[PDB]
């Protein structure tokens, strides 16, 4: 990410579903019961009073009046208080939680298959005379031919260019890139795929063609892997510095659009009422 | 068309009934047979064990049991299955380049999420609910103590703490008004503290303490709370016996292993066992498909899979080269996509445990009105 | 009566002016001298260093320096001072049973301020407040336009959104009432979001985490932003150089090593440094008296102090026996209580920061009232 | 010590030591300023309105008159709401702390130093034939 | 390594008289110097820390609506009510 990415998730609330209809019909039934009890013009005032009691007690309405009316008003106020406390706690818990999404999460993406006619052209970070570039050339030619334009000298220079924003995307070995991301400066750079690899093939110790060491070396390496020394060695040599350790203006855009839509609906309803 | 025994129980009329088999390994085998040139006669194993060293009963020697014994016999050929690479296995037979990578991935049944504000008194102290029920009345009595409309004043006092704002209760005494304001401020402070406590309980709502890894002291220390399962004592027992420090923690799993791969899973989902140690792929796919259990832990003993061979057969080099070509061609990732990459996968109790109270109050309002009317008519 | 120098700054005219010295170690020395019937002529060290060995100029032959060198070169006879036991030292100097138990520990300045309490709605966005106010004004204007008492309705809406409860709003259409209910719900949601942001900032109190020991990778990996070093001549350098796992930190600290504890502490005072590794007792006392810094982190390389002397000396067994006897019968605990461990050490900014602003209203409204006085005269 | 947890709470911590006095005095100062502003049962009405705005809007009265008085009341209500939100946040953050009591250190206590008397029969369990 | 981490040592390790463990030996045996040097070297080279973390590391060692507030607020309410009653009595008397 260029900068800090956070998802407000305004539309991810459990509302706008069967639960919202459930609470709406429950409130309507409660309002009907209140009107019937008070009657034992006032319907609209009582509806406004209950809407305020759900939202804020700053809406004075005198539709209900009675001992049973007082009891039900107290019950409604307690229910609203519990609901708002629960909603505040849930929003705080969500704020504690995080929701980070991937950028592309795929090598053969739409972007990295024909990037000429899609936005400003992207970047294919790599270095020639390697092993990943050969695979890119062998699989599909057009992406390699476009990648021939962007090419640094090594790896550290490419990372510096990426941090400075000179280039856009980097493609290289998985283990080296993972090590670089784990021990980066400020943990500001993270791979697009969260533990995603495309052409998994391990490293190796290239012997000679038919050398009388292959059996012993293979057996010793398998024994080393089994006995557990590899775990401690990887912990010592390959471990990130942070790696594992881990009223907004933009957040109110969706709710403001919803408020504008409700405003348009209210204006249409008022016009229709004036017509009749 | 598989040709394998159907009587899975040990000791039965072993029937060579033909069966139907397919999947990842079968697709890989078909691809290999198209790339190379041969024909296959796939037949299922007789016993079911993966294969491990064991001493021959009523003797002192040792022999290869399970599926590996067939490889060390006439059948042999081109064993393809979710095999794993190990020193003992590689000493006798020779493997190929791995066609997958997997770990161990401790599996535990997911805890039931019940913290959804179903009960208001669950986070805080239930007795506190009563400890404020009557005290308010006493405060109202204190206001009446300044008197020297009773029902209206009582209802007003009961509603003020709930922001009713009736305004129908106003004793003439100024000290009574001061006491009422003090009580209102106290109630505001109390409700603020209660909301803060509820928010803190919601934030710190993490009762789960699932053991992570094999070096966790809770998992390291043996006990009788739950029971482990090493699954059939094959390809994992070798690892546990190899590690002597783990061999100290071997006995508990040693005397409690199962004899298959899915029966122990059924027992785990039947609330009989809560533990598992198997290959990463199997457990991860099972957790993804059955949206009931999840895998918690870090991968360890990362040894890849691999197709099997015998001694030194001429098929080794070409098969390994074909597997590497398939890896570099994108074929393997595409095949994994179509076979194992997708299988299915305001609190509800907060709005459920309080709407019932509202409905009950609405129902009882008519009864209370009738009772009040009858009481008025009596006098 | 100590007999040390006062030319610690190089090039000064050393004269060995007699001075004074009255420490806890001096009390232990007095007790030891009284018990054993001898006499002492204590004098300070010439250079000042705990005796970390080094090589002579352009010659591969090791030689000592500081206190250890002075003792070994037939100059002194006893080294009663903090002389933490090591392995390179103990090869040829016969130490005694320890009279203290301490280990290395970090030292870092403690962040005195953690909150302001006078911040407006800046942490979320001031532009968010601006757009919220604009939206409130727009919805109010549309509500008063669709009425076909605009000032009274505006005052009522302002009171409702600020929870004043003016109650002066009299909508003429039910559509306006529904819009007002929706706006009240939106205001409640906005208040909930603001409180959620406040709680998120509050729970995140002290974002600056504390470095724990030396195992933390955030300190093991060097950077030009962080600077720390212990002293150019002590047992900490001997401990680090001996074991080879973090030679990068070795070079980083060698580029900036200091000379004495007092200079390093003074440098920490003006934030020239950021961390300090040193003995537990000294840092604990320094935190106890001037509690502006902190003693975070764990402790490593546990090895107590001791009293050193040559390999062949007729005082060895007796000195060790006396130290152990005093330690057991509790004379040392009294000294510890007396000398080393003896001392111990929402606000108005949330109100005044707005209270004076309230005074501004008292300096702004009245004149406007005069304008209102003109407004009646104008019309 | 598992018999009694005795978990510390906010009540054990000092409350209304000196900050509450400052809060009360500036509240009184602001109330007097508002009364003077409204001047050019009214005093009681203003006091009730200020106390309600501080605590909760369930205490309405016709104390403020004019646009300036309404603006001052709204500003005071907003300040009180912000203060309440800050107090709720502080109370929520307080719950992540739970201290412990040590008190007696070593054998320097009358429970250990005085063998007999006291009131409850204590014990000094120590296995024999050792260093202790 | 207690069961449920119930019992606790009083204070933060307020050791009365720290002495320390140690291997024994015969009077003036020739093994003293080598044993002492080896033990010091082992202590220095971070091995004893691994042994301590492996052998005698426990579980609770890592680990570490109030009624008191209700009692306090009840006391405050009672005091306020008493003050109100006293003010009413004084008003009646005068």
Using the Cβ of B197 and the Cβ atoms of chain D, whether some distance falls under 8 Å is answered with yes
User: Is residue A221 classed exposed, middle or buried when 0-12, 13-18 and 19+ CB atoms within 10 A define those classes?
Assistant: middle
Give the up-direction half-sphere exposure of residue C92: CA atoms within 13 A in the CB hemisphere.
Answer: 7
Which of C162, C184, C206, C352 is the mutation pick for testing D, counting most D CBs within 10 A?
Answer: C162
How far, in Å, CA of C110 to CA of B181, rounded?
Answer: 43
Give the up-direction half-sphere exposure of residue B19: CA atoms within 13 A in the CB hemisphere.
Answer: 15
What residues contact residue A160 under an 8 Å CB cut-off, 6+ apart? none
Q: Answer whether C230's CB lies under 8 Å from C258's CB.
A: yes
User: Helices then strands (H, E): number in chain B?
Assistant: 16, 6
How far, in Å, CA of E60 to CA of E48, rounded?
Answer: 21
Q: Which of B290, B108, B326 is nearest to B208 (CA)?
A: B108
Which of E17, E21, E34, E50 is the mutation pick for testing C, counting most C CBs within 10 A?
Answer: E17
Q: Which of A67, A59, A57, A60 is nearest to A37 (CA)?
A: A67
- Distance from first CA to last CA of chain A, Å, rounded? 56
**Bind-site residues of B for glycine:** 82, 84, 89, 235, 279
Interface contact E69-D9, CB threshold 8 A: yes
Phi, psi of B108 (to 5 degrees): -140, 140
Contact list, B182 vs chain E (CB under 8 Å): 77, 80, 84
Gaps in chain C (C–N > 2.5 Å) come after which residues?
148, 345
How far, in Å, CA of C317 to CA of B204, rounded?
Answer: 59
Burial readout B33-56 (b: 16 or more C-beta within 10 A, e: otherwise): eeeeeeeeeebebeebbbbbbeee
Q: Answer whether D82's CB lies under 8 Å from D75's CB.
A: no
Number of Cβ atoms within 10 Å of the Cβ of E37: 13
Task: Supply the angle between the helices C174-203 and A42-55 in degrees, to the nearest 10.
Answer: 10
Q: Which of B89, B366, D78 is nearest to A39 (CA)?
A: B366
**Under DSSP, is residue B268 helix (H, G, I), strand (E, B) or coil?**
helix
Residue of A nearest to D56 (CA): A57
How far, in Å, CA of B119 to CA of C26, rounded?
Answer: 67
Sign of the alpha-carbon dihedral angle for C31, C35, C41, C45: negative
Interface contact E76-B125, CB threshold 8 A: no
What residues contact residue C337 under an 8 Å CB cut-off, 6+ apart? none
Residue of D nearest to E8 (CA): D1
Contact list, E85 vs chain B (CB under 8 Å): 142, 145-146, 175
Interface contact D81-C162, CB threshold 8 A: yes
DSSP string, C142-187: HHHHTT--HHHHHHHHHHHHTT--------SSHHHHHHHHHHHHHH
3-state SS, B338-368, equals HHCCCCCCCCHHHHHHHHHHHHHHHHHHHHH
Contact list, B165 vs chain D (CB under 8 Å): 57-60
How far, in Å, CA of A115 to CA of A34, rounded?
Answer: 63
Using the Cβ of A179 and the Cβ atoms of chain C, whether some distance falls under 8 Å is answered with no
A182 alpha carbon, distance to own chain's centre: 21
Burial readout B103-121 (b: 16 or more C-beta within 10 A, e: otherwise): bbbbbbbeeeeeebbeebe
**Under DSSP, is residue D15 helix (H, G, I), strand (E, B) or coil?**
coil
In the block, residue with structure tokens 């082992």? E42
Residue of B nearest to E56 (CA): B217
In the block, residue with structure tokens 């929701």? A99
DSSP state of C75: S
How far, in Å, CA of E70 to CA of E72, rounded?
Answer: 5
Resolution in A: 3.8
Instruction: List B54's β-bridge partners, or say none.
Output: B63
Q: Which of A31, A42, A64, A69 is nearest to B372 (CA)?
A: A69
Q: Is A133 left (phi over 0), alpha (psi -120 to 50) or beta?
A: alpha
CA distance C76 to chain A (A): 46
C282 alpha carbon, distance to own chain's centre: 15
How far, in Å, CA of C278 to CA of C268, rounded?
Answer: 13
Q: Answer whether C84's CB lies under 8 Å from C278's CB.
A: no
**Nearest 5 degrees, angle CA C369-CA C370-CA C371?**
85
Q: Answer whether B98's CB lies under 8 Å from B92's CB.
A: no
How far, in Å, CA of B163 to CA of A78, rounded?
Answer: 9
DSSP string, chain A: --S------GGGSS-SSHHHHHHHHHHHHHHHHHHHHHH--HHHHHHHHHHHHHH-S-----S--SHHHHHHHHHHHHHHHHHHHHHHHHHHHHHHS-----S---TT-SGGG-GGGSSS----B--SSSSHHHHHHHH-HHHHHHHTTS--SSSHHHHHHHHHTS-S-B---HHHHHHHHHT-STT----SSTT--SS---------TT-TTHHHHHHHHHHHHHHTHHHHHHHHHS--SSTT----TTTTHHHHHHHHHHHHHHHHHHHHHHH-
Which of C176, C181, C222 is the mutation pick for testing A, counting most A CBs within 10 A?
Answer: C181
How far, in Å, CA of A70 to CA of B166, rounded?
Answer: 9
Which whole-number Å values give the CA distances from E1 to B217, E8, E55, in the listed order? 10, 11, 11
Interface contact C86-E16, CB threshold 8 A: no
Q: Answer whether B165's CB lies under 8 Å from D58's CB.
A: yes
How far, in Å, CA of C163 to CA of C140, rounded?
Answer: 16
Contact list, A239 vs chain C (CB under 8 Å): 217
Confirm or deny that C279 is annotated as ligand binding: yes
Interface contact A57-B163, CB threshold 8 A: yes
Q: Is C51 left (phi over 0), alpha (psi -120 to 50) or beta?
A: left
User: Is residue E50 classed exposed, middle or buried when 0-12, 13-18 and 19+ CB atoms within 10 A define those classes?
Assistant: exposed
How far, in Å, CA of B3 to CA of B24, rounded?
Answer: 18
Contact list, C117 vs chain D (CB under 8 Å): 86
Interface contact B205-A14, CB threshold 8 A: no
How far, in Å, CA of B272 to CA of B265, rounded?
Answer: 10
DSSP state of C104: E
Number of Cβ atoms within 10 Å of the Cβ of B141: 12
How far, in Å, CA of B105 to CA of B117, rounded?
Answer: 33
Contact list, D2 vs chain E (CB under 8 Å): 4, 6-7
DSSP string, C323-368: HHHHHHHTHHHHHIIIIIS------THHHHHHHHHHHHHHTTHHHH
Burial readout C95-131 (b: 16 or more C-beta within 10 A, e: otherwise): bbbbbbebebbbbbbeeeeebeeeeebeebbeebbee
In the block, residue with structure tokens 């129902």? B363
How far, in Å, CA of B2 to CA of B16, rounded?
Answer: 10
Furthest C-alpha separation in chain B: 111
Report D:48-67 residues touching C (Cβ under 8 A): 53, 57, 60, 66-67
Q: Which of A135, A206, A121, A130 is nearest to A168 (CA)?
A: A121
Report the relative pairing of strands B293-295 and B107-109 from DSSP bridges.
Answer: antiparallel
How far, in Å, CA of C244 to CA of C233, rounded?
Answer: 19
Q: Which of C287, C284, C364, C370 is nearest to C104 (CA)?
A: C284
Q: Which of C102, C114, C120, C138 is nearest to C284 (CA)?
A: C102
Report the relative pairing of strands C104-105 and C278-279 from DSSP bridges.
Answer: antiparallel
- Which residue intervals of chain C are DSSP H helices? 24-36, 66-72, 87-90, 126-145, 150-161, 174-203, 217-220, 235-242, 247-254, 261-269, 280-289, 316-329, 331-335, 349-362, 365-378
Q: Which chains touch D (3 or more CB pairs under 8 A)?
A: A, B, C, E
CA distance E82 to chain D (A): 20
3-state SS, E9-57, equals CCCCCCCCCCCCCCCCCCCCCCCHHHHHHHHHHHHHCCHHHHHHHHHCC
Q: Say how many residues make up chain A.
A: 276
Which whole-number Å values give the CA distances from C156 to A107, B366, C147, C148, D56, in the listed order? 59, 35, 15, 19, 17
Which pair of structure tokens corresponds to residue C364? 């702004």
Number of Cβ atoms within 10 Å of the Cβ of B240: 18
Interface contact C351-D30, CB threshold 8 A: no
B368 alpha carbon, distance to own chain's centre: 49
Of D37, D60, D86, the CB nearest to C362: D37
What residues contact residue C31 under an 8 Å CB cut-off, 6+ apart? C326, C331
How far, in Å, CA of C233 to CA of A210, rounded?
Answer: 57
Which pair of structure tokens corresponds to residue C172? 């003429």
Contact list, C201 vs chain D (CB under 8 Å): 89
How far, in Å, CA of B198 to CA of C225, rounded?
Answer: 41
Using the Cβ of A88 and the Cβ atoms of chain C, whether some distance falls under 8 Å is answered with yes
3-state SS, D75-94, equals HHHHHHHHHHHHHHHHHHHH
Phi, psi of C94 (to 5 degrees): -85, 105
Q: Which chains touch B (3 or more CB pairs under 8 A)?
A: A, C, D, E
Touching, C vs E (3+ Cβ pairs under 8 A): yes
Q: Answer whether B241's CB lies under 8 Å from B250's CB.
A: yes
Of E19, E20, E41, the CB nearest to C87: E41
What residues contact residue B25 under an 8 Å CB cut-off, 6+ apart? B80, B81, B82
Using the Cβ of E87 and the Cβ atoms of chain B, whether some distance falls under 8 Å is answered with yes
Number of Cβ atoms within 10 Å of the Cβ of A8: 17
How far, in Å, CA of A15 to CA of A267, rounded?
Answer: 24
Residue of D nearest to B174 (CA): D44
Which whole-number Å values give the CA distances from C287 to C33, C83, E25, in the listed order? 32, 22, 41
Of B124, B178, B189, the CB nearest to E65: B124
How far, in Å, CA of B348 to CA of C11, rounded?
Answer: 80
Which residues of D lie closer than 8 Å to A, measured between beta carbons?
A: 57-58, 92
Q: Answer whether C63's CB lies under 8 Å from C72's CB.
A: no
CA distance B161 to chain D (A): 9
How far, in Å, CA of A34 to CA of B366, rounded?
Answer: 10
How far, in Å, CA of B162 to CA of D58, rounded?
Answer: 9
In the block, residue with structure tokens 């992207």? A122
Of C301, C303, C333, the CB nearest to E17: C333
Contact list, E91 vs chain B (CB under 8 Å): 175
Q: Say how many residues make up chain D.
A: 132
How far, in Å, CA of C360 to CA of C366, rounded?
Answer: 11
How far, in Å, CA of C195 to CA of A87, rounded?
Answer: 11
Contact list, A57 vs chain B (CB under 8 Å): 163, 165
3-state SS, B62-124, equals EEECHHHHHHCCCCCCCCCCCCECCHHHHHHCCCCCCCCCCCCCCEEECCCCCCCCCCCCCCC
Number of Cβ atoms within 10 Å of the Cβ of C195: 24
Q: Which of A115, A126, A180 is nearest to A151 (CA)?
A: A126
How far, in Å, CA of C117 to CA of C353, rounded?
Answer: 9
CA distance A148 to chain C (A): 35
Which pair of structure tokens corresponds to residue C366? 């009245």
Furthest C-alpha separation in chain C: 113
Using the Cβ of B142 and the Cβ atoms of chain E, whether some distance falls under 8 Å is answered with yes
Phi, psi of B298 (to 5 degrees): -115, 140
């Amino acid at each position: 990410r260029s900068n800090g990415t956070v998802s407000p998730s305004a539309f991810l609330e459990p509302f706008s579903a069967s639960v919202w209809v459930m609470m709406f019909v429950m409130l309507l039934i409660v309002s009907a019961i209140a009107v019937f009890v008070f009657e034992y013009f006032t319907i609209g005032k009582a509806i406004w009073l209950l809407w305020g009691l759900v939202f804020n007690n700053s809406v004075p309405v005198q539709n209900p009046k009675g001992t049973t009316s007082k009891i039900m008003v107290s019950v409604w106020a307690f229910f609203a208080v519990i609901f708002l406390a629960s909603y505040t706690a849930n929003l705080a818990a969500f704020m504690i939680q995080e929701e980070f999404v991937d950028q592309v999460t795929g090598l053969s993406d739409k972007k990295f298959q024909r990037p000429h006619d899609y936005s400003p052209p992207f970047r294919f970070g790599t270095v020639p005379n390697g092993s990943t570039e050969r695979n890119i050339r062998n699989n599909y030619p057009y992406m390699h031919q476009y990648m021939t334009k962007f090419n640094q000298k090594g790896v550290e220079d490419a990372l510096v260019s990426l941090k400075t924003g000179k280039l856009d995307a980097f493609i290289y070995d998985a283990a080296v890139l993972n090590y670089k991301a784990g021990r980066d400066e400020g943990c500001k750079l993270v791979t697009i795929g969260s533990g995603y690899i495309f052409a998994t093939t391990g490293y190796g110790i290239a012997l000679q063609k038919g050398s009388p060491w292959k059996r012993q070396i293979d057996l010793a390496l398998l024994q080393f892997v089994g006995d557990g020394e590899m775990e401690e060695l990887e912990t010592l040599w390959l471990t990130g510095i942070c790696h594992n350790e881990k009223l907004d203006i933009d957040n109110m855009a969706g709710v403001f659009y919803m408020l504008a839509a409700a405003m348009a609906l209210s204006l249409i309803t008022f016009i229709w009422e004036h017509l009749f | 068309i598989c040709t394998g025994p159907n009587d899975t129980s040990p000791g039965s009329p072993r029937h060579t009934v033909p069966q139907c088999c397919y999947g990842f390994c079968i697709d890989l085998l078909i691809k290999l047979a198209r790339t190379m040139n041969f024909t296959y006669e796939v037949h299922l194993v007789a016993d079911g064990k993966f294969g491990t060293q064991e001493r021959v009963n009523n003797s002192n020697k040792k022999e290869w049991n399970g599926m590996m014994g067939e490889l060390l016999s006439g059948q042999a050929d081109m064993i393809v299955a979710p095999l794993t690479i190990n020193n003992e296995r590689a000493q006798y037979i020779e493997f190929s380049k791995p066609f997958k990578y997997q770990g161990l991935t401790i599996l535990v049944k997911k805890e039931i999420p019940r913290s959804t504000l179903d009960s208001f008194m669950q986070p805080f102290q239930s007795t506190l609910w009563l400890l404020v029920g009557l005290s308010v009345h006493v405060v109202a009595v204190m206001l009446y103590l300044l008197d020297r409309t009773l029902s209206s004043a009582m209802w007003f006092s009961w509603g003020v703490l709930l922001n009713s704002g009736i305004g129908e209760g106003a004793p003439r005494s100024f000290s009574a008004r001061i006491l009422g304001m003090v009580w209102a401020g106290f109630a505001m402070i109390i409700v603020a503290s209660y909301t803060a406590n509820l928010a803190a309980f919601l934030v710190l709502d993490r009762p789960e303490e699932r053991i992570t890894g094999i070096n966790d002291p809770r998992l390291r220390n043996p006990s009788d709370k739950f029971i482990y399962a090493t699954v059939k004592q094959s390809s994992v027992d070798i690892y546990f016996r190899r590690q002597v420090e783990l061999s100290t923690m071997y006995r508990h799993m040693e005397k409690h292993n199962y004899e298959s791969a899915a029966e122990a899973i059924q027992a785990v989902r039947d609330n009989k066992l809560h533990a598992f140690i198997w290959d990463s792929a199997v457990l991860e796919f099972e957790a993804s498909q059955k949206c009931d259990l999840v895998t918690t832990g870090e991968l360890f003993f990362r040894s890849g899979f691999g197709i099997g061979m015998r001694k030194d057969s001429p098929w080794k080099q070409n098969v390994s080269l074909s597997i590497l070509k398939s890896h570099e061609n994108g074929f393997m990732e595409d095949l994994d996509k179509t076979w194992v990459r997708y299988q299915e996968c305001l609190t509800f109790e907060n709005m459920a445990g309080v709407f019932m109270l509202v409905a009950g109050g609405i129902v009882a309002g008519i009864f209370l009105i009738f009772i009040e009317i009858a009481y008025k008519r009596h006098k």
